[model samples]
Target: GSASPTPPYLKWAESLHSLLDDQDGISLFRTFLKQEGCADLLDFWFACTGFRKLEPCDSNEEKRLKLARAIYRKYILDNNGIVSRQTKPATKSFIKGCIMKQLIDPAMFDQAQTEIQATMEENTYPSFLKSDIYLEYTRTGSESPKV
Candidate 1:
């Protein structure tokens, strides 16, 4: 019996950049992180990128401010949010200041994003590649006998 081969998920294990580039890879990685109870880091990473991708126009200023505040409340606030343990205190403080002044800009969370990305790459990524959710596919498709 043949099932669709797993999306080239093997390529994901090769690099964090590769992993994040694919939608399925991101979904699987999110599932893996959520299961490990470290989804906050990945969520914060996404928030940062989402924030950066917003168009820098006067009409979107309010939207930008709203997202910045949301990111702060959800991840920067102490005990009030999931709070990424990976983001440095200094970065959080800087972000708090930016939100307080409503000085929202695309790069506001860049430092925190970089730190979180590094943490994920160094910590969760290796374990993810080894997890059953990923390794189970190794015996499928080309690895199986021709039927």
Candidate 2:
């Protein structure tokens, strides 16, 4: 084209695939997220992803149980902070059942996340996409998102 370069993070905002796939951009977003109060949303999402992978291993039973309990306690059960816009039908129960018994498919949260987008419509995600912190990247001569 005939213009300047784009900030990697700004380009990522256009596509979930791009945004989620960019490790460095995500790390940069995490730095910005702390100010947005959405840091835990990313944290919970990533932790659950890791949780999904920890299965069928020789991981310590006690510590694993404790970590699982803590994870679900905060993300699924508790609602005081960084709560997901999901579990409309006692959504917390969806994960609690499997967390206690065995590994649930990561696909479960994918369903939850997809549904939550429909429900909340807008939140920290869009907020960050348009936030001043992100906009600062705009000054870097980044191309705007297609969305």
Candidate 3:
């Protein structure tokens, strides 16, 4: 009871960036997300970034609608979905309207995605860096690449 535990990663800021940049770091981060029951946040992050790359616009109606049905319909409103919880009301409503319209854009989840990313960065990531589990991973020589 006399002391706090030594942190898992020594270079705090650099380690946090490495958590996203390196494979071993991400493996640990994935386990952390899974443990926190927010594993879907990482999925949402990837999906949104994937959609961002498409920039599926008016001319890309076929592609845009595909994501609306595939990603948005399946993930964003699944209720049981992890991504759904991260979605704010206004963004959800906007998406609902777009779904009804049968025509949507790549930026459909822009605002919600922004909020999710910000929360992960400002709150979650920092905690992950400081968590005992993360420290353990460092002590144990990082998570396996096969994980």
RMSD of each: 4.9, 6.6, 7.6
* Order of models, best TM-score first: 1, 3, 2
- Model 2 / residue 19 / CA error / Å: 2.2
TM-score of each: 0.83, 0.65, 0.71
Regions of candidate 3 where Cα sits further than 4 Å from its true position: 1-18, 57-60, 139-147
- lDDT, candidate 2, equals 0.62
Tens-digit lDDT string for candidate 1 (70-120): 888888784544454667789888999998898887898999889888888
Task: List per-prediction Cα lDDT, in the order shown.
Answer: 0.82, 0.62, 0.72
As a whole number from 0 to 100, the lDDT of residue 2 in candidate 2 is 90
| Deviation (Å) of 141 in candidate 1 | 2.8
Question: How many collisions per candidate?
Answer: 0, 1, 1
lDDT of 2 by residue, 93-133 (tens): 77677676766454445544555443323565666677666
Best lDDT goes to which candidate? Answer: 1
Error of 2 at 1 (Å): 14
The best-first sequence of candidates by lDDT reads 1, 3, 2
**Of 1 and 2, the candidate ranking higher by TM-score:** 1
lDDT of 3 by residue, 30-134 (tens): 788889888777777778778867865458878777776777776678898767877787888887888888757667778877877876887778888778876
